[PDB]
């Protein structure tokens, strides 16, 4: 359906995304996914961001993400992004589609992890996490990828 067949999100990455998203329920937070492909499987090993957590400048976002990237594993690379949409359920907005298309122009296997962390933050159970991982097909459809 799209360039990447499926995705494996390592627990430390998922933890980082969820902590960010769940710590910031008033905001549609974002960051980068760090990992590597292994054939048709895209591995998400880590996540970084230049955004603030919680209740809160491009110049600060750039510094912070550069600092995080400087500490990242040199055998890994940017494989996508995440975006939280508290209370909106899980889909790519029109804006998100544009962004994802831009990511894919940088790296054809890039993916978009969308999370709605409201229920997780209420229940404190990962099984209440609402998320999907998306890519955009050539013909412009939003495709939801298998995730382990």
Residue numbers in the entry: -3 to 52, 57 to 148
From the publication, what sentences describe this entry?
The first complete archaeal Ub modifier system, including E2 and E3 enzymes, was discovered in 2011 in Candidatus Caldiarchaeum subterraneum. C. subterraneum Ub (CsUb), E1, E2, and E3 are organized in a single operon, adjacent to a second E3 protein and a JAMM protease (CsRpn11) with high sequence similarity to eukaryotic Rpn119. We have shown that CsRpn11 is highly active on its own, cleaving both CsUb precursors and, at a later stage of the ubiquitination cascade, CsUb-conjugated substrate proteins. Our bioinformatic, structural, and biochemical results reveal unique features of the archaeal proteins, but also remarkable conceptual similarities with their eukaryotic counterparts.
To determine crystal structures for CsRpn11, we used the full-length wild-type form and a series of truncated proteins with deletions C-terminal of the JAMM core domain. Using these constructs, we obtained crystals for full-length CsRpn11 and truncated CsRpn11Δ149–202, for which we collected data to 1.65 Å and 1.35 Å resolution. We located two protomers in the asymmetric unit, which form a homodimer grossly reminiscent of the Rpn8–Rpn11 heterodimer. However, while the latter is assembled in an antiparallel fashion, the CsRpn11 homodimer is parallel, with an interface formed by the first and the fourth alpha-helix, H1 and H4, of CsRpn11. In the truncated CsRpn11Δ149–202 structure, however, which is lacking H4, and which we solved on the basis of the full-length Rpn11 coordinates, this dimerization is not observed. At 45 °C, truncated CsRpn11 processed CsUb-pre with a KM of 24.2 µM and a kcat of 3.5 min−1, and bound the reaction product with a KD of 14.6 µM. With a KM of 31.6 µM and a kcat of 4.0 min−1, the full-length version displayed similar reaction parameters, indicating that the CsRpn11 C-terminal helices are indeed not critically required for catalysis.
